[PDB]
Every structure is written in structure tokens, then in C-alpha cells.
């Protein structure tokens, strides 16, 4: 009957680049989901396969809280059956996804006046990610027949590009913090 460390995920001072998303495993605790829903500090809070209002009266064997930073534009891709450089090359939800997706603007916290290039995304990949795949490889992408061998140049490009975040970016180009809750043998997470 210990409470779940949702604060440690949502209120974390450092979030991760979406290519190397973080996954907090949640077990052996009670979680009040309506407490999040009624925060009302979220711009996206869209649940697939379940009701937000009906979440508290439920149990699951394990809960996963995946969290990262993308840009306004791209939040629409954190949902099932989606295409794009995020959905395809960084973070993919399965079609039978049955959790919730939560997001809020983080310009005040995640953008710098000089430009904040710490957050990154993967731009070049030969094929899509399987759902909940995590690709951290920084091998030089090979765009042509002759092989790169770790030397950039023509047809040989670094696969990761950087979000430049500036507070003066337009809304869609600003950083959003995203937490995906996946709902998954005896149980350990209830309300």
C-alpha cells in the first residue's frame, strides 16, 4: 500500500532525448490516476483502450511509464497507427496500445536563448521501429552503395539530429514533455 512514484517521472528535472527514451517500471504500489487527470495542466491527455475516469478502479500486473521530449508538431505521433520521423524512427506505440498518452509544454524548462541542442531525435533509419523498440546506435548512416566505415561525407550521415529549442520558437516548434503509461500473472498496481 505504498504510493506509486509518479512524481519521480512527471516531476523529473531532466527528461531524455526521444531516441533514447526512458522507461520507468512501476510495481507493488497503489496509484490514483484521477489525481493526474484532474491536474488539468496537460494539453494532451488521451487514453486508448480505457477510460481516464475509470482507471482508478483497476489493477495491472505491471505499469510502464515511458517519458521523453519531442516538439509540439510531433505529439500527434505518440499514438497508435501513426507515421512520421518520431513514430517511425524514435518511439512507436503498437496498434493495440491500451494505455494513456500525456503531454505538456516545457518551453520555460527545456529551451535556451542561445539554442538548446541537448535534446536529439533520430532522422535517418533504414526501417521502422518495432513497437517499444529503443535504438541508441550512432553508426554512420549509409545512403549509397559504398560503405561509410565511420566517416561522414556524401551518402554517409550522422543518424541523430538535434532539436534546436529557443523560447522564441513558434508553438509547434517548441518542446513538449511526454509521458506514456502502458498497462500490462498476479497483480501489484491498483487504486
Amino acid at each position, epitope marked *: 500500500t505504498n504510493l506509486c512514484p509518479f512524481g519521480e517521472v512527471f516531476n523529473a528535472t531532466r527528461f531524455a532525448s526521444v531516441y533514447a527514451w526512458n522507461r520507468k517500471r512501476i510495481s507493488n504500489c497503489v496509484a490514483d490516476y484521477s489525481v493526474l487527470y484532474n491536474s488539468a495542466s496537460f494539453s494532451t491527455f488521451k487514453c486508448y483502450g480505457v477510460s481516464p475516469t475509470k482507471l482508478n478502479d483497476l489493477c495491472f500486473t505491471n505499469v510502464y511509464a515511458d517519458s521523453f521530449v519531442i516538439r509540439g508538431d510531433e505529439v500527434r505521433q505518440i499514438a497508435p497507427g501513426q*507515421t512520421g520521423k518520431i513514430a517511425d524512427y524514435n518511439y512507436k506505440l503498437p496498434d493495440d496500445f491500451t494505455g494513456c498518452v500525456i503531454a505538456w509544454n516545457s518551453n520555460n524548462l527545456d529551451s535556451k536563448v542561445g539554442g538548446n541542442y541537448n535534446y536529439l531525435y533520430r532522422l535517418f533509419r533504414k526501417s*521502422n521501429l518495432k513497437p517499444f523498440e529503443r535504438d541508441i546506435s550512432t553508426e554512420i548512416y549509409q*545512403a*549509397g*552503395s559504398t560503405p561509410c566505415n565511420g566517416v561522414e561525407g*556524401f551518402n554517409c*550521415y550522422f543518424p541523430l539530429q538535434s532539436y*534546436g529549442f529557443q523560447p522564441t520558437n*513558434g508553438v509547434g516548434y517548441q518542446p513538449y514533455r511526454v509521458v506514456v503509461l502502458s498497462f500490462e500473472a498476479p497483480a501489484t498496481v491498483c487504486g
Partner: antibody
């Protein structure tokens, strides 16, 4: 390093046509790939985009009528054009897209003509 | 969506002078995506600038990209005869869009 369009010719309105883009020096299945057309005396209009991983995107003007594909074994990008209208009359180019580094390789085009 | 408007429609000058072509986006826009292309009669476009300021390889020192936010600017410091073509700018949303082109013509 080349992109060589074929397939272009004369078509009746409502007909169809498949443009080919034989590539060499870049392998098509490993890149973002674009069809850009130019109508007589007019500008560049992006028309269709295909991801390395297979996702596709189209301009509203051709949505539902055009489909972009490829053939890894022939290193050839295709564009299938159905339900052709008088306005799809143009010179069609394939480019390779590096998104952040521009479209750095282009074809000289194939000319499509649509009329009755 | 993004709508790029290029000004002027036609720029007229003579060899040696400095051309300043302008690209205006309908909303605030990422500078990582703003390419400039050159097109000479009967020819496929040529990439001159990527990012917003980077010269593609093979592009001479005269060409130079600037701008951010919504206003971008291609500059040719000392025009040469071969520089009199049409010039297009480009941005990226979920897909490419282009400007309507600026004509570079010889003043007379």
C-alpha cells in the same frame, strides 16, 4: 550519381501513367525520396515523399490519385498517377531528400502531357 | 501549413552588384530546414544553401544564407553572368513546400 526519369508521355484526362526513376550512386530504399513537378511557366511543386521505412506523404492536389513506390531489386523509384487531369501536365523530377541538408540530387525530369 | 512568399518577383541588376533575395514564411519556422535552390532555363534545380546558412559543396563563396524566424535572405555578393536564373526557397512541415521563385534579370 544520377537520377533518370522515364515513363512520361501523352495521356487522356482520367487516364493513368507510371513514371520511373532509375537511380545510381544512391540506393533508393535507403533514402527519403521526392517527386517534384513543374508546370509550364510555373514553379516547383512538391508532390510526393517516401520514407526509407516506407511511410508516404502526398500533396492535397494529388491525394488519392498518385501513389509512390520503389523496387529495391531494380534501384528504381516509381510514381503511379491515376485519374489524371489537365493540371498534372508538367515536368516531373525525383530528388533525394536529406531533409536537413536539402534535396542535393535531382533528375532532369520526364514530361507528362494530359489532354483530350 | 507553411506558405513561403518570395520577394521581389523579379530582381533586376547587373554583373558585379549585390543581389538580396527574400523568403517570407507564413509562420515561425525552423532554420534547420530552409534551403535555397537555383534553376537556369531548361535545367533541374541546384541546391545552393541548406540549413539556412550552409553552402552545399561546390557552391561558390558569393552565395550566402541568412535569416531566422520568418524572414530569410539569400545574398550574392558580386553577381556573375551565370547567376541570372530563377531562385526558389524551401521549408519543411511534414513534407516540403517551395517559394514561388524570384527571377534574376539583367538591368538595362
Amino acid at each position: 550519381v544520377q537520377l533518370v526519369e522515364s515513363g512520361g508521355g501523352l495521356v487522356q484526362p482520367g487516364g493513368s501513367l507510371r513514371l520511373s526513376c532509375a537511380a545510381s550512386g544512391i540506393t533508393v530504399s535507403s533514402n527519403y525520396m521526392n517527386w517534384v513537378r513543374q508546370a509550364p511557366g510555373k514553379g516547383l511543386e512538391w508532390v510526393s515523399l517516401i520514407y526509407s521505412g516506407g511511410s508516404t506523404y502526398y500533396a492535397d492536389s494529388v491525394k488519392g490519385r498518385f501513389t509512390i513506390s520503389r523496387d529495391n531489386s531494380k534501384n528504381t523509384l516509381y510514381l503511379q498517377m491515376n485519374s489524371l487531369r489537365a493540371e498534372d501536365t508538367a515536368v516531373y523530377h525525383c530528388a533525394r531528400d536529406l531533409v536537413v541538408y536539402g534535396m542535393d540530387v535531382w533528375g532532369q525530369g520526364t514530361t507528362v502531357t494530359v489532354s483530350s | 501549413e507553411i506558405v513561403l512568399t518570395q520577394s521581389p518577383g523579379t530582381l533586376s541588376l547587373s554583373p558585379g552588384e549585390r543581389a538580396t533575395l527574400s523568403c517570407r514564411a507564413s509562420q515561425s519556422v525552423s532554420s534547420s530546414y530552409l534551403a535555397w535552390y537555383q534553376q537556369k532555363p531548361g535545367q533541374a534545380p541546384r541546391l545552393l544553401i541548406y540549413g539556412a546558412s550552409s553552402r552545399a559543396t561546390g557552391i561558390p563563396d558569393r552565395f550566402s544564407g541568412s535569416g531566422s524566424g520568418t524572414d530569410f535572405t539569400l545574398t550574392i555578393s558580386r553577381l556573375e553572368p551565370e547567376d541570372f536564373a530563377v531562385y526558389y526557397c524551401q521549408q519543411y512541415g511534414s513534407s516540403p513546400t517551395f517559394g514561388q521563385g524570384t527571377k534574376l534579370e539583367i538591368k538595362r
